[PDB]
Design a protein around this ligand. Structure first.
Ligand SMILES: CNc1cc2c(cc1[N+](=O)[O-])n(C)c(=O)n2C
Length: 123
């Protein structure tokens, strides 16, 4: 149906916007601390602590499968990256502090993204 095609176009447009957002967020992580899943070789007990691991590569895979239906779902995964890190690592660590900085700098990007999704009507 034409309605189905229209819905699919909207999702493709949302995916394009979220791709730009993801690239911008990842730019705020120049150390690439959040680029890949936390290694279970370097951190053997990680899954005893963190029940829902997340990272930018995993988000990008979901993104390109058009697996984010709205901005909220995308933000939930971004928040997991940050929140997991601030639980596993102590305040004095380079890991915790990277998550704080990514959260702060990312908030700016996500604030305008919400405005764009609403205004253009992508969900
Ligand atoms: C980039 N590498 C990395 C990233 C981590 C991490 C451990 C490593 N590691 O290599 O051992 N932990 C515990 C963590 O929370 N993050 C975000």
């Amino acid at each position: 149906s034409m309605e189905q095609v229209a819905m699919e176009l909207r999702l493709t447009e949302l995916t394009r916007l979220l791709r730009s957002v993801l690239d911008q967020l990842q730019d705020k992580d120049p150390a690439r601390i959040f680029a890949q899943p936390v290694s279970l070789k370097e951190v053997p007990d990680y899954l005893d602590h963190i029940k829902h691991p997340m990272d930018f590569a995993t988000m990008r895979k979901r993104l390109e499968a058009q697996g984010y239906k709205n901005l909220h779902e995308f933000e939930e995964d971004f928040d997991l990256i940050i929140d997991n890190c601030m639980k596993y690592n102590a305040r004095d660590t380079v890991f915790y502090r990277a998550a704080v900085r990514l959260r702060d700098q990312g908030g700016v990007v996500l604030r305008q993204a919400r405005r764009e999704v609403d205004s253009i009507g992508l969900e």
